[PDB]
Amino acid sequence: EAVVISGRKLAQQIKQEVRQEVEEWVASGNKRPHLSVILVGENPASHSYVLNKTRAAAVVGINSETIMKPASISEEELLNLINKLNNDDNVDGLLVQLPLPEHIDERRICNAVSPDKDVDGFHVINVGRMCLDQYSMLPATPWGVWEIIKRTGIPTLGKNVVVAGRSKNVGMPIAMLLHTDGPGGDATVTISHRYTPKEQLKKHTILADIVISAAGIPNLITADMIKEGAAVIDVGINRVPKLVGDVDFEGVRQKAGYITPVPGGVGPMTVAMLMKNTIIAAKK
Amino acid sequence: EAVVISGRKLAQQIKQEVRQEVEEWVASGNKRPHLSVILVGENPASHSYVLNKTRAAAVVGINSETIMKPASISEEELLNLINKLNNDDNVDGLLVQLPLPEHIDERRICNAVSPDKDVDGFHVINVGRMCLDQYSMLPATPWGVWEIIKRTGIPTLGKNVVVAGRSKNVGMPIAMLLHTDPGGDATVTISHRYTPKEQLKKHTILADIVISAAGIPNLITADMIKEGAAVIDVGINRPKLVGDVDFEGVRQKAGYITPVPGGVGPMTVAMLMKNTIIAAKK
Ligand SMILES: Cc1cc(Nc2nc3c(c(=O)n(Cc4cc5c(Cl)cccc5[nH]4)c(=O)n3C)n2C)nc(CCC(=O)O)n1
Ligand SMILES: Cc1cc(Nc2nc3c(c(=O)n(Cc4cc5c(Cl)cccc5[nH]4)c(=O)n3C)n2C)nc(CCC(=O)O)n1
Ligand SMILES: Nc1ncnc(O)c1NC(=O)Nc1ccc(C(=O)N[C@@H](CCC(=O)O)C(=O)O)cc1
Ligand SMILES: Nc1ncnc(O)c1NC(=O)Nc1ccc(C(=O)N[C@@H](CCC(=O)O)C(=O)O)cc1
């Protein structure tokens, strides 16, 4: 039987460290960290995820505010709001929850957030810093995946990692961290493409010690794709009427040596790492 | 028998294209393009390589200088020289040859070159732009790998690509371009040097394209290649110079192959000429 990694437990431990770190930082006389989140429109997933983030902020000692704007906002008002928060010395972290309405250019918005406040690491400069090991702040979901691996003690050096991504924004940053020299796993990394044949993907997963699925299709990762003892980390978000990941949990539970559940796996880790990035931002 | 791709011939053709575009940009009454290359110290590979760059600038009509400085130069001195060239309206392209001496922070140096003059694409925002498909200027060697594949006509949509990386700086830009929606749309593997030949082989035999940038003689042999696959040799091994590939062994099985020397190396220099006309036109 596979070990089932509790994302909740690891996040809870990570959040406890941030509280300790935030409390000491305030005990030295500094301003309490503040995180601002801009939420546009009404994606139910987005509101749910943003509520998780501000809940986690309060219980770790980080002040927070969510600014909700209707979807009919223009790109110019969103830029004015971002520019205001960039200049607010009480605001340490600023993130924009994605996706944005189609009439707004996401890349323009993410590049308008000040790079010192970019707790998501979506600004072009922070993407470059991550590539070049200059960083201060790492994208929360890739860093969350890495902490699951590292804190569980799963070996990466020289190992075979496969990342099944829906987009390059998602699979490449995960791959980059595991490929980086030891954050960084010294691992061989395969990044499967969109619409890649499942059996073509299979010939890569069969070899993998660590399969990381972030494609958003149900049952992409079944037992006939895993060698025994392989760690399987589920990043998929799927509605099928309930939430599931990319892995057939009960099936792969037999074959695999490690498996993360959805919910309760990567999700809580994403939120927890965002807390780490916010204290980092408040410290400069 | 594997068809051998002459990187030299392909690169000389690209330089002819750059030349006409430079000579037309000048005929139209703009300043002739100027490339400045900063060389620190005495690494012989660095000098040979920079020689090939200024020789290519001459052929294609771009003015150029190599500014050679002793290895004892301080970081502050180098930054001051870079700042001067950044502000010199005659300079269009500016690169610092690497490696630099250990008392100079190479990341600080590359991030001090103006991003508009950064014809190597080593400035952090240019690296970020390349990741996010916002760029106008690709690093020369990965872009050269891509032109080879492209002008040869090797298909990449859905194919398996394996890059044998030596550092993250070398294999990952190559993988970035090949995995991207210049696109390429390929399943990409970047192997770390801590994965043995035995496990790397499990990946290379599935690969329609194998790109070796590991700097390890005879890393790629015919057993690791599936029949008909393209093999791009990026490696440099130094009394002769060879690439990572057993050229003779795998010319029997590959579908395409590039030689070392005369393969990726001339493409690197050619693509740098393209980045420099791009920079000159703002
Ligand atoms: C609705 C939505 C939006 C969304 N946007 C999104 N995810 C991102 C990014 C992003 O810019 N970067 C930085 C980066 C490094 C990087 C590198 Cl190193 C190479 C190449 C590209 C790179 N981008 C990321 O790492 N991630 C994870 N964006 C814009 N992601 C999801 C799915 C996962 C989730 O739920 O967050 N959903
Ligand atoms: C001694 C030496 C130094 C050296 N320096 C070196 N090569 C580099 C870089 C670099 O920053 N980038 C941009 C990049 C994109 C990028 C992405 Cl997208 C992801 C991750 C990292 C990334 N870096 C590169 O693409 N390359 C190829 N550097 C600093 N390169 C060689 C081999 C070249 C040769 O000898 O031909 N040798
Ligand atoms: N879109 C973005 N824009 C800007 N920056 C970002 O980081 C994102 N990305 C997210 O915010 N991604 C995210 C996804 C899921 C959770 C999460 O909490 N999942 C739970 C509950 C499941 C549910 O309620 O449906 C679980 O799996 O346990 C948290 C964050
Ligand atoms: N280090 C760097 N710092 C800053 N920007 C860079 O781009 C680099 N990287 C290079 O400059 N890499 C490079 C490697 C080989 C050649 C080359 O000309 N190879 C020839 C002859 C081989 C020989 O003469 O030894 C061939 O293979 O045929 C040219 C450039």
XYZ file of C-alpha atoms and ligand atoms in Angstrom:
700
model
C 0.000 0.000 0.000
C 1.205 3.504 -0.886
C 2.022 6.025 1.809
C -0.628 8.735 1.529
C 1.043 12.122 2.024
C -1.127 14.608 3.885
C -0.769 17.995 2.261
C -2.775 19.339 5.190
C -0.198 18.148 7.754
C 2.811 19.479 5.877
C 1.083 22.813 5.248
C 0.153 23.034 8.920
C 3.798 22.537 9.881
C 4.921 25.068 7.258
C 2.302 27.533 8.477
C 3.512 27.100 12.071
C 7.026 28.113 10.977
C 5.678 31.244 9.281
C 3.763 32.222 12.413
C 6.938 31.791 14.454
C 8.879 33.787 11.866
C 6.219 36.521 11.614
C 5.861 36.812 15.408
C 9.589 37.230 15.962
C 9.742 39.782 13.181
C 7.014 41.867 14.820
C 8.654 41.336 18.233
C 11.711 43.212 16.902
C 9.571 46.308 16.206
C 8.783 45.886 12.516
C 5.456 46.463 10.768
C 3.140 43.466 10.668
C 3.179 41.845 7.196
C 0.239 42.712 4.980
C -0.961 40.850 1.881
C -3.382 42.357 -0.641
C -5.206 40.059 -3.086
C -7.114 41.369 -6.097
C -10.028 39.178 -7.120
C -11.812 40.012 -10.370
C -15.157 38.560 -11.228
C -16.817 35.533 -9.930
C -15.020 32.247 -10.717
C -16.264 30.133 -7.726
C -12.941 28.304 -7.641
C -11.163 31.657 -7.469
C -13.174 32.948 -4.505
C -12.714 29.629 -2.709
C -8.935 29.688 -3.308
C -8.621 33.342 -2.256
C -10.576 32.658 0.947
C -8.180 29.822 1.762
C -5.255 32.234 1.279
C -6.594 34.987 3.536
C -7.695 32.445 6.178
C -4.138 31.104 6.247
C -2.793 34.657 6.452
C -4.790 35.580 9.541
C -3.856 32.455 11.501
C -0.133 32.990 10.751
C -0.214 36.630 11.855
C -0.283 38.258 8.390
C -2.793 41.044 7.823
C -4.661 40.726 4.571
C -7.292 42.357 2.430
C -9.130 41.044 -0.580
C -10.206 43.688 -3.088
C -13.000 42.326 -5.264
C -13.729 44.059 -8.563
C -16.436 43.147 -11.078
C -15.394 41.375 -14.288
C -16.435 44.368 -16.412
C -13.511 46.302 -14.999
C -11.268 47.756 -17.657
C -7.609 46.920 -17.886
C -6.840 50.560 -17.132
C -8.656 50.590 -13.786
C -6.971 47.316 -12.805
C -3.624 48.896 -13.617
C -4.495 52.005 -11.591
C -5.465 49.820 -8.613
C -2.218 47.819 -8.894
C -0.182 51.010 -9.158
C -1.860 52.351 -6.010
C -1.021 49.197 -4.021
C 2.539 49.173 -5.392
C 2.941 52.596 -3.770
C 1.181 51.761 -0.474
C 3.957 51.284 2.062
C 1.637 49.211 4.241
C 1.344 46.594 1.438
C 4.124 43.993 1.403
C 2.566 41.341 -0.810
C 0.297 41.928 -3.779
C -1.166 39.155 -5.877
C -3.741 39.072 -8.654
C -5.844 35.932 -8.703
C -6.083 34.396 -12.159
C -7.873 33.810 -14.501
C -8.768 37.375 -15.550
C -11.601 38.344 -17.919
C -10.722 37.830 -21.571
C -10.589 41.557 -22.368
C -7.668 42.038 -19.956
C -4.110 41.039 -20.843
C -2.938 38.713 -18.042
C 0.759 39.136 -18.883
C 0.471 42.928 -18.777
C -1.265 42.727 -15.398
C 1.304 40.359 -13.888
C 4.162 42.566 -15.092
C 2.537 45.650 -13.476
C 2.797 44.168 -9.974
C 5.978 45.463 -8.367
C 8.619 42.680 -8.403
C 9.406 43.242 -4.711
C 5.707 42.636 -3.927
C 5.167 39.768 -6.404
C 4.460 37.021 -3.879
C 3.290 34.767 -6.735
C 6.513 35.206 -8.711
C 4.570 35.766 -11.945
C 6.451 38.951 -12.937
C 8.849 38.456 -15.857
C 11.834 39.481 -13.693
C 11.004 36.925 -11.000
C 10.505 34.269 -13.667
C 14.018 35.100 -14.878
C 15.423 35.120 -11.331
C 13.971 31.642 -10.772
C 15.616 30.452 -13.991
C 18.924 31.991 -12.886
C 18.817 31.017 -9.153
C 18.665 34.691 -8.156
C 15.294 34.480 -6.582
C 13.676 35.687 -3.408
C 10.168 34.351 -4.063
C 9.139 31.224 -5.829
C 5.769 30.448 -7.417
C 3.653 28.913 -4.682
C 2.414 25.776 -6.431
C 5.845 24.645 -7.803
C 7.465 25.396 -4.468
C 4.630 23.535 -2.746
C 5.265 20.447 -4.876
C 8.961 20.648 -4.031
C 8.321 20.891 -0.295
C 6.111 17.814 -0.428
C 8.998 15.900 -2.005
C 11.683 17.342 0.244
C 9.795 17.215 3.539
C 8.565 13.654 2.886
C 12.232 12.825 2.229
C 11.728 11.426 -1.265
C 15.071 11.191 -3.140
C 15.486 13.291 -6.290
C 19.207 13.359 -7.139
C 19.715 11.707 -10.518
C 16.156 10.355 -10.465
C 13.547 10.300 -13.236
C 10.827 12.956 -12.868
C 7.911 13.320 -15.298
C 5.724 16.454 -15.261
C 2.430 16.265 -17.156
C 1.457 19.895 -17.634
C -1.600 21.592 -19.079
C 0.434 24.707 -19.934
C 4.069 25.755 -19.850
C 3.316 28.207 -17.011
C 2.562 25.187 -14.795
C 4.793 22.304 -15.841
C 8.008 24.163 -16.620
C 8.412 25.891 -13.202
C 7.846 22.546 -11.466
C 10.383 20.944 -13.788
C 12.848 23.804 -13.296
C 12.950 23.405 -9.529
C 13.505 19.669 -9.703
C 16.146 20.024 -12.408
C 18.043 22.782 -10.586
C 21.304 21.941 -8.812
C 20.846 21.105 -5.143
C 15.550 24.316 -3.539
C 16.508 21.981 -6.387
C 16.517 18.248 -6.955
C 19.353 17.489 -9.455
C 16.832 15.349 -11.312
C 16.192 14.346 -14.890
C 12.904 15.904 -15.893
C 10.470 15.147 -18.709
C 7.780 17.715 -19.535
C 4.966 16.059 -21.410
C 3.119 18.100 -23.950
C -0.509 19.065 -24.255
C -2.669 16.480 -25.971
C 0.186 13.992 -25.715
C -0.866 10.377 -26.408
C -1.595 8.645 -23.122
C 0.478 5.612 -24.135
C 3.222 7.933 -25.415
C 3.107 9.573 -22.005
C 3.021 6.056 -20.559
C 6.472 5.150 -21.911
C 7.877 8.086 -19.960
C 5.893 7.540 -16.743
C 6.841 3.819 -16.585
C 10.461 4.949 -16.098
C 9.680 7.694 -13.589
C 10.495 7.609 -9.896
C 8.318 10.728 -9.442
C 5.240 11.470 -11.551
C 3.782 14.977 -11.142
C 0.469 15.358 -12.929
C -0.844 18.869 -13.489
C -2.857 18.397 -16.660
C -6.441 18.518 -15.446
C -7.900 15.387 -16.954
C -9.375 12.683 -14.720
C -7.666 9.293 -14.646
C -4.685 10.383 -16.716
C -2.493 8.532 -14.218
C -3.668 4.945 -13.708
C -1.740 2.021 -12.243
C -0.485 0.759 -15.605
C 1.686 3.891 -15.838
C 3.640 3.571 -12.596
C 6.523 1.413 -11.520
C 6.326 0.169 -7.955
C 7.475 2.518 -5.214
C 7.227 5.577 -7.455
C 6.037 8.778 -5.795
C 2.911 10.208 -7.471
C 2.012 13.845 -6.815
C -1.413 14.982 -7.996
C -1.757 18.624 -9.078
C -4.859 18.208 -11.222
C -8.075 20.090 -10.525
C -11.120 18.360 -12.010
C -14.914 18.433 -11.670
C -16.546 15.106 -12.567
C -20.307 16.545 -9.280
C -17.126 16.654 -7.139
C -13.437 17.631 -7.154
C -10.806 15.073 -8.231
C -7.213 15.166 -9.440
C -5.432 13.573 -12.384
C -4.726 10.264 -10.653
C -7.014 7.273 -10.158
C -6.421 7.325 -6.411
C -7.667 3.866 -5.438
C -5.892 2.188 -8.363
C -2.518 3.890 -8.055
C -2.737 3.433 -4.257
C -1.735 -0.212 -4.827
C 1.072 0.261 -7.378
C 2.660 3.429 -5.970
C 4.955 4.006 -3.021
C 3.704 7.560 -2.343
C 0.565 9.405 -3.369
C -0.958 12.774 -2.595
C -4.747 13.154 -2.390
C -6.900 15.811 -4.005
C -8.193 17.695 -1.973
C -5.754 17.877 0.930
C -2.542 17.448 -1.069
C -0.835 20.137 -3.166
C -3.594 22.708 -2.587
C -2.820 23.395 1.098
C 0.877 23.513 0.203
C 0.270 26.205 -2.441
C -1.428 28.373 0.186
C 1.250 27.672 2.792
C 4.132 28.602 0.488
C 2.380 31.864 -0.371
C 2.615 32.588 3.362
C 6.384 31.996 3.198
C 6.676 34.349 0.205
C 4.763 37.072 2.057
C 7.031 37.130 5.112
C 9.998 37.088 2.702
C 8.516 40.114 0.931
C 7.907 41.995 4.175
C 11.567 41.535 5.179
C 13.238 42.769 1.940
C 23.742 6.271 -43.317
C 22.839 9.468 -41.425
C 22.751 12.693 -43.406
C 25.292 15.068 -41.921
C 24.228 18.679 -41.412
C 26.948 21.230 -42.032
C 26.473 23.855 -39.361
C 29.188 25.915 -41.017
C 27.379 26.002 -44.361
C 24.010 26.804 -42.757
C 25.641 29.532 -40.635
C 27.417 31.149 -43.610
C 24.055 31.308 -45.369
C 22.526 33.037 -42.326
C 25.426 35.488 -42.264
C 24.772 36.301 -45.929
C 21.169 37.078 -44.956
C 22.344 39.271 -42.105
C 24.796 41.060 -44.388
C 22.124 42.109 -46.910
C 19.870 43.282 -44.077
C 22.713 45.306 -42.550
C 23.713 46.772 -45.908
C 20.076 47.691 -46.612
C 19.638 49.204 -43.142
C 22.708 51.347 -43.893
C 21.708 52.214 -47.474
C 18.492 53.552 -45.931
C 20.704 55.977 -43.990
C 20.938 54.477 -40.509
C 24.158 54.155 -38.520
C 26.156 51.006 -39.238
C 25.650 48.410 -36.459
C 28.358 48.062 -33.815
C 29.008 45.063 -31.548
C 31.272 45.366 -28.479
C 32.585 42.144 -26.893
C 34.290 42.360 -23.491
C 36.995 39.727 -22.896
C 38.522 39.363 -19.397
C 41.706 37.367 -18.881
C 43.333 34.680 -20.959
C 41.119 31.610 -21.293
C 42.156 30.236 -24.719
C 38.706 28.838 -25.539
C 37.236 32.258 -24.797
C 39.698 33.900 -27.177
C 39.118 31.451 -30.023
C 35.339 31.857 -29.637
C 35.447 35.662 -29.523
C 37.717 35.608 -32.545
C 35.049 33.719 -34.440
C 32.469 36.297 -33.345
C 34.375 39.391 -34.532
C 35.279 37.633 -37.744
C 31.554 37.036 -38.381
C 30.765 40.651 -37.551
C 33.282 41.703 -40.205
C 31.794 39.452 -42.909
C 28.250 40.734 -42.297
C 29.035 44.458 -42.195
C 28.765 45.120 -38.455
C 31.498 47.180 -36.828
C 32.998 45.415 -33.834
C 35.670 45.623 -31.174
C 36.942 43.147 -28.632
C 37.832 44.990 -25.437
C 40.370 42.790 -23.642
C 41.001 43.402 -19.934
C 43.328 41.609 -17.518
C 41.840 39.042 -15.164
C 42.816 41.263 -12.216
C 40.118 43.788 -13.142
C 37.689 44.484 -10.322
C 33.944 44.064 -10.604
C 33.442 47.821 -10.145
C 35.819 48.519 -13.051
C 33.909 46.079 -15.284
C 30.558 47.620 -14.348
C 31.946 51.061 -15.143
C 33.083 49.892 -18.570
C 29.648 48.326 -19.139
C 27.864 51.491 -18.001
C 29.973 53.487 -20.475
C 29.076 51.161 -23.348
C 25.381 51.135 -22.298
C 25.327 54.931 -22.714
C 27.319 55.017 -25.976
C 24.798 55.626 -28.783
C 27.258 54.087 -31.268
C 27.089 50.678 -29.479
C 24.134 48.492 -30.452
C 25.153 45.079 -29.104
C 27.159 44.392 -25.946
C 28.167 40.974 -24.586
C 30.610 39.811 -21.892
C 32.371 36.573 -22.737
C 32.069 33.955 -20.007
C 33.507 32.570 -17.778
C 34.679 35.541 -15.724
C 37.102 35.398 -12.778
C 35.656 34.232 -9.456
C 35.994 37.686 -7.835
C 33.429 39.041 -10.313
C 29.761 38.164 -9.954
C 28.752 36.939 -13.398
C 25.054 37.373 -12.723
C 25.602 41.012 -11.712
C 27.665 41.617 -14.863
C 25.089 40.131 -17.241
C 22.294 42.024 -15.479
C 24.225 45.298 -15.873
C 24.219 45.099 -19.677
C 21.329 47.149 -21.014
C 18.503 44.740 -21.931
C 18.159 46.483 -25.317
C 21.891 45.877 -26.024
C 21.866 42.347 -24.589
C 22.571 40.363 -27.723
C 23.433 37.234 -25.727
C 20.070 37.236 -23.967
C 21.713 36.702 -20.567
C 19.974 39.626 -18.811
C 17.463 38.365 -16.238
C 14.505 40.107 -17.849
C 15.488 38.689 -21.247
C 15.632 35.251 -19.647
C 12.195 35.881 -18.149
C 10.837 37.097 -21.497
C 12.162 33.976 -23.196
C 10.299 31.820 -20.647
C 7.060 33.776 -21.114
C 7.314 34.194 -24.946
C 7.712 37.969 -24.632
C 11.209 38.110 -26.084
C 12.767 39.671 -29.092
C 16.226 38.216 -28.448
C 16.973 34.550 -27.925
C 20.332 33.319 -26.590
C 22.559 32.428 -29.517
C 23.346 28.771 -28.921
C 19.766 27.507 -28.234
C 18.442 29.589 -31.107
C 21.162 28.061 -33.278
C 20.095 24.571 -32.213
C 16.567 25.508 -33.234
C 17.504 26.966 -36.642
C 19.374 23.747 -37.467
C 16.263 21.664 -36.751
C 14.080 24.211 -38.518
C 15.997 24.826 -41.739
C 16.703 21.102 -42.052
C 12.963 20.476 -41.726
C 13.121 18.000 -38.837
C 9.611 17.697 -37.343
C 9.067 18.417 -33.659
C 5.279 18.500 -33.083
C 4.628 15.794 -30.503
C 8.079 14.233 -30.905
C 10.230 13.158 -27.952
C 13.242 15.416 -27.417
C 16.020 14.603 -24.969
C 18.530 17.271 -23.961
C 21.557 16.039 -22.004
C 22.255 19.132 -19.954
C 25.546 20.023 -18.318
C 24.252 23.014 -16.435
C 20.799 24.464 -16.174
C 22.089 27.430 -18.217
C 22.789 25.199 -21.243
C 20.184 22.466 -21.475
C 17.155 24.333 -20.204
C 17.095 27.195 -22.752
C 17.327 24.519 -25.444
C 14.443 22.592 -23.858
C 12.473 25.797 -23.289
C 12.488 26.588 -27.012
C 11.744 23.021 -28.061
C 8.925 22.502 -25.563
C 7.237 25.825 -26.298
C 3.933 26.247 -28.101
C 10.057 29.943 -32.305
C 7.838 27.165 -30.907
C 8.360 23.416 -31.299
C 5.584 21.777 -29.261
C 7.598 18.735 -28.210
C 7.746 16.457 -25.209
C 11.100 17.369 -23.719
C 13.446 15.600 -21.324
C 16.379 17.436 -19.762
C 18.737 14.970 -18.121
C 20.957 15.954 -15.249
C 24.616 14.985 -15.255
C 23.904 12.968 -12.063
C 21.823 10.466 -14.071
C 24.082 7.638 -15.363
C 24.566 6.766 -18.987
C 22.491 3.656 -18.197
C 19.387 5.611 -17.161
C 19.874 8.402 -19.719
C 19.835 5.644 -22.339
C 16.305 4.650 -21.293
C 15.248 8.165 -22.427
C 17.391 8.595 -25.553
C 16.078 5.430 -27.234
C 12.544 6.871 -27.149
C 13.763 10.180 -28.587
C 13.144 11.419 -32.132
C 15.747 14.139 -31.439
C 18.744 13.870 -29.100
C 20.594 17.078 -28.247
C 23.705 16.527 -26.173
C 25.209 19.471 -24.298
C 26.931 17.546 -21.510
C 30.593 18.137 -22.406
C 31.404 14.422 -22.017
C 33.238 12.556 -24.820
C 31.361 9.580 -26.266
C 28.301 10.268 -24.123
C 26.015 9.321 -27.044
C 26.593 6.012 -28.836
C 24.595 4.011 -31.356
C 22.994 1.794 -28.704
C 21.350 4.851 -27.105
C 19.910 6.141 -30.405
C 16.789 4.754 -32.016
C 17.181 4.250 -35.742
C 16.563 7.332 -37.870
C 16.722 9.881 -35.033
C 18.334 13.313 -35.278
C 21.398 13.887 -33.078
C 22.602 17.445 -32.460
C 26.024 17.568 -30.795
C 26.430 20.737 -28.701
C 29.384 19.449 -26.682
C 32.976 20.735 -26.731
C 35.723 18.450 -25.528
C 39.416 19.404 -25.615
C 45.330 16.951 -28.741
C 41.955 17.221 -30.568
C 38.423 18.662 -30.220
C 35.373 16.367 -30.243
C 31.729 16.559 -29.228
C 29.687 14.366 -26.911
C 28.737 11.995 -29.721
C 30.556 9.022 -31.229
C 30.210 10.510 -34.703
C 31.400 7.434 -36.585
C 29.429 4.925 -34.528
C 26.092 6.758 -34.668
C 26.338 8.060 -38.247
C 25.294 4.462 -39.046
C 21.980 4.690 -37.146
C 20.998 8.371 -36.874
C 18.715 10.008 -39.408
C 20.519 13.338 -39.091
C 23.726 14.274 -37.281
C 25.799 17.373 -36.744
C 29.593 17.258 -36.476
C 31.891 18.890 -33.939
C 33.577 21.151 -34.942
C 31.602 22.836 -37.704
C 28.129 22.157 -36.277
C 26.377 24.152 -33.519
C 29.385 26.396 -32.900
C 29.120 28.354 -36.192
C 25.339 28.556 -35.689
C 25.917 30.194 -32.314
C 28.003 32.894 -33.953
C 25.513 33.340 -36.812
C 22.531 33.779 -34.485
C 24.540 36.380 -32.535
C 24.835 38.385 -35.772
C 21.025 38.232 -36.121
C 20.533 39.435 -32.531
C 22.861 42.356 -33.240
C 20.948 43.679 -36.267
C 17.784 43.194 -34.184
C 19.294 45.297 -31.417
C 20.503 47.937 -33.840
C 16.932 48.440 -35.107
C 15.552 48.932 -31.550
C -5.975 29.942 -13.738
C -4.503 29.560 -13.619
C -3.497 30.467 -13.909
C -2.179 30.066 -13.783
N -1.260 31.000 -14.098
C 0.040 30.879 -13.822
N 0.591 29.887 -13.141
C 1.883 30.172 -13.089
C 2.134 31.329 -13.732
C 3.393 31.813 -13.808
O 3.666 32.869 -14.383
N 4.391 31.135 -13.219
C 5.800 31.643 -13.289
C 6.605 30.911 -14.386
C 7.810 30.351 -14.263
C 8.104 29.830 -15.475
C 9.174 29.163 -15.907
Cl 10.397 28.898 -14.803
C 9.283 28.715 -17.222
C 8.229 28.970 -18.095
C 7.132 29.671 -17.608
C 7.093 30.077 -16.318
N 6.165 30.753 -15.629
C 4.121 29.973 -12.586
O 5.016 29.327 -12.050
N 2.873 29.489 -12.518
C 2.590 28.205 -11.808
N 0.965 31.774 -14.181
C 0.738 33.024 -14.970
N -1.922 28.787 -13.391
C -2.935 27.928 -13.118
C -2.760 26.441 -12.722
C -2.067 26.165 -11.394
C -2.752 26.965 -10.298
O -3.904 26.594 -9.927
O -2.076 27.920 -9.855
N -4.201 28.328 -13.241
C 31.478 28.870 -19.570
C 30.078 28.931 -20.143
C 29.167 29.864 -19.667
C 27.889 29.889 -20.216
N 27.016 30.800 -19.732
C 25.734 30.880 -20.112
N 25.189 30.199 -21.094
C 23.922 30.594 -21.131
C 23.669 31.505 -20.171
C 22.430 32.031 -20.022
O 22.137 32.870 -19.163
N 21.458 31.646 -20.856
C 20.093 32.229 -20.713
C 19.161 31.257 -19.974
C 17.917 30.948 -20.330
C 17.496 30.074 -19.411
C 16.334 29.450 -19.296
Cl 15.148 29.774 -20.453
C 16.109 28.560 -18.264
C 17.113 28.333 -17.336
C 18.310 29.008 -17.483
C 18.474 29.850 -18.517
N 19.518 30.595 -18.875
C 21.728 30.736 -21.815
O 20.869 30.362 -22.600
N 22.953 30.211 -21.952
C 23.243 29.206 -23.006
N 24.820 31.682 -19.535
C 24.985 32.622 -18.392
N 27.585 29.008 -21.178
C 28.482 28.102 -21.607
C 28.078 27.128 -22.721
C 27.863 27.954 -24.008
C 28.927 27.537 -25.031
O 30.073 27.288 -24.595
O 28.560 27.455 -26.226
N 29.727 28.070 -21.106
N -5.177 30.811 -10.049
C -4.109 31.550 -9.410
N -3.919 32.884 -9.591
C -2.855 33.538 -8.936
N -2.011 32.875 -8.108
C -2.219 31.529 -7.935
O -1.419 30.782 -7.105
C -3.290 30.888 -8.587
N -3.486 29.501 -8.379
C -4.167 29.121 -7.190
O -4.537 29.918 -6.375
N -4.312 27.717 -7.086
C -4.921 27.057 -5.969
C -5.612 25.980 -6.242
C -6.263 25.217 -5.108
C -6.102 25.667 -3.894
C -6.768 24.876 -2.797
O -6.862 25.336 -1.706
N -7.276 23.569 -3.132
C -7.897 22.835 -2.022
C -9.454 22.952 -2.019
C -10.130 22.498 -3.286
C -11.392 23.317 -3.664
O -11.937 24.110 -2.842
O -11.950 23.241 -4.809
C -7.267 21.431 -1.948
O -6.942 20.788 -2.977
O -7.003 20.900 -0.847
C -5.280 26.905 -3.565
C -4.732 27.553 -4.566
N 31.028 31.460 -23.207
C 30.110 32.445 -23.700
N 30.037 33.699 -23.141
C 29.113 34.632 -23.660
N 28.310 34.336 -24.721
C 28.399 33.086 -25.282
O 27.613 32.677 -26.345
C 29.325 32.144 -24.766
N 29.384 30.861 -25.395
C 30.172 30.723 -26.591
O 30.759 31.653 -27.083
N 30.209 29.407 -27.140
C 30.896 29.097 -28.373
C 31.378 27.872 -28.518
C 32.056 27.480 -29.807
C 32.154 28.390 -30.755
C 32.837 27.988 -32.024
O 33.156 28.830 -32.773
N 33.088 26.589 -32.249
C 33.714 26.235 -33.528
C 35.253 26.087 -33.435
C 35.676 25.419 -32.155
C 37.032 25.954 -31.670
O 37.677 26.785 -32.338
O 37.562 25.594 -30.580
C 33.007 24.971 -34.028
O 32.391 24.207 -33.228
O 33.045 24.657 -35.242
C 31.600 29.812 -30.640
C 30.987 30.122 -29.492
